[PDB]
Each structure stands twice: as structure tokens, then as C-alpha cells.
Amino acid sequence: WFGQDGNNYMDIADLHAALQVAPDLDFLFFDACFMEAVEVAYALRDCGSYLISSPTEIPGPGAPYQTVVPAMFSAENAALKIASCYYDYYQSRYDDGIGMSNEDWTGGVSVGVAKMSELENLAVATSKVLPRYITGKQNFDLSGVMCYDRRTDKQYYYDLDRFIYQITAGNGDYDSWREAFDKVMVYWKSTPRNYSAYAGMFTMNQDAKGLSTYIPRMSAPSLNTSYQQTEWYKVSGWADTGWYK
């Protein structure tokens, strides 16, 4: 979901429905947690050109709007300039979380920009992989696959690229898929570590690409069911895996 108004939270489907009255946007900047997800990118691919957020947690003080606002009004490449501004600010003050606070953020940050128009190609690419390499229903061996979710009782978001790499053992099918994915993330920068309000400073794996994905798990059948409601699920090939078929 996105947005919390008291005890209300906007489902992504409802958000998409709302953005239909919006003109086509150059960028959709989510100064909010966990929004750089393939499922959000795909669901909102028709609302704009670029998705800007973090696959993991966003710092409380958020964007340096003293520099981000001018970035938003650039002639062109606003999306890239928004991201680079956001990143450069926190990397300049990065001190591996020493003396971390809202008023002095030394925990760094990670920002990615996704090209929305390539999300359909990515869904096609992914559908060629998932049923073929996920024939059974079983918890995955996810060691080495960057987890953007530092809440060990949730662990919702994993790096999509590293996950596809894992299940294909980086074979020739990965390279094919990787070609399609390379066209999606146009920006991805991160400090060596980020700050989690749940776990503290955590390492951002150097091979992470900045776009998250969900992964089914035996512990959360209700959430596996909920994932069948996403539009990405319907086109990603997950329906034809051993987890859902």
C-alpha cells in the first residue's frame, strides 16, 4: 500500500484508479518507503514515464527539497536529477550511521529510477523464466539475494535481479532476462549501508539493482494469496509456477 491517513491506507489498485484523472506524468516520485517495487512499477506503468523511490526504507527527513525542487523543474532528465540530488545529499553526510538522527542523517540512502515503458517487456521476460525454474512449491534458498526488508518477521522485499540470478544459477536464461531488465533501471545509487528503523544500519549488497520483488513463503499463505491480486502476478509467470499452478 501507500499512504497512511489515520487508520486508512491506499491500496495500489486504488492509487492507480486515482491517477487516471492525472495527465501523463514525467515522473512519479515516491518519497516513501519500499515503493521501488516491480509490482508498483508495473501497476503504475500507464501513469507516467519514470518511477522514483527506494526499494527499502526511506529516511525520515526524506528528500532535500531545497535541491530536489529545482531538479523537478529541469528542462529534461528531471527524474534522473531528482534521484541524483536525493542521493548526493545523503552520501555527502554519510558516516556509516554514526550519530544517526533525523536532524543529522548519517545513515545514507538508496535511490532508484525505473523506466515504466519497459515494464511490459520485463513481464514478458520474467514469464519465460519463472514457470521454467519454479516447478515445485517450496521455500527458496535466498542467501546472497539482497533483502530490502530488514523486519525479520516480514521480509517482504527482495532484489528482483538477484532472485532471477539465483533460480537460474546465472545461466543463459539469466542473460536473456538480464537484457530486458537492463532497460528498466536507469538509475541506482546507494551508500555502502542504509539505516533501518527496525534493524539499524544494514549492508546494501553491491550486486543489488534497486528494484524489489515479492517472494512466496510457507509462513505467509494469506500474503501469498494477496499477491495473486497484483497485476504483476498475472503477467510475471508466477501463476504458472509450482507455487500457484
Partner: protein
């Protein structure tokens, strides 16, 4: 025309409410080095007081000033039709060559709402 309109949508009626003010002030500061004749920065802010749609324009002296576009009764800003109304008001009043939108709140990816009715 080179003009651009950006709506910043702040669902701040939460734990981030104390942080909303700083960002808005940072926006004014950033708006200073922005051509306020062609660039339109609109801000919807719903914190611990009544929602309001404003515009961060410059006065005739160049000082960044808040311009009230519409005031709202208290409402769920995480509701689609509420967002629709604000989006409609924002962009229809300020058509431009390019557009952008900022989403300012708590986030949890694709995950369904933790509270549902049936």
C-alpha cells in the same frame, strides 16, 4: 512554453506529521532558484489540521509565498476519490508543457491495506 506543473501529495496525518513542515519549508527554499512564472509547484498537505491545496509561487518582489488554491474539510487523503479531486483541481487549474507528481507519506510497496471492510 517550457512550463511544468508538479503536485506534491502529502498524506501526513501520521507519525510523519512533525516532519512535514521542514520539507515544505525546504520546498520554498528550493523554489527560490526556480522560474515561478512557468513552473508550478502545488502542494497538498494533510497533517494534524485541515487539508489544504496551496501553490508555492513568488510575490512581485521574488519572495516565495504560499497561495491557497483550495481548503478542504477533514477527510481521508488516502481515499482515491479524494486524491482524484485534488489531482483534478491541481492540474486543470495549472496546465503545462510537462507534469510530475510527488508522493509523500508512509510506504509499504504492493502490500494490501492492513485494515479492510467486507
Amino acid at each position: 512554453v517550457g512550463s511544468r506543473t508538479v503536485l506534491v501529495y502529502m498524506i501526513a496525518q501520521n507519525s510523519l506529521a512533525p516532519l512535514a513542515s521542514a520539507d515544505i519549508e525546504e520546498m520554498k527554499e528550493g523554489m527560490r532558484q526556480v522560474d515561478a512564472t512557468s513552473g508550478n509547484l502545488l502542494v497538498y498537505i494533510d497533517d494534524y489540521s485541515a487539508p489544504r491545496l496551496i501553490r508555492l509561487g513568488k510575490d512581485k518582489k521574488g519572495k516565495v509565498v504560499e497561495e491557497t488554491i483550495e481548503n478542504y474539510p477533514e477527510q481521508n487523503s488516502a481515499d482515491a476519490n479524494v486524491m482524484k479531486k485534488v489531482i483534478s483541481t491541481a492540474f486543470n487549474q495549472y496546465k503545462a508543457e510537462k507534469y510530475g507528481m510527488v508522493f509523500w507519506s508512509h510506504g509499504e510497496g504492493w502490500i494490501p491495506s492492513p485494515a479492510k471492510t467486507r
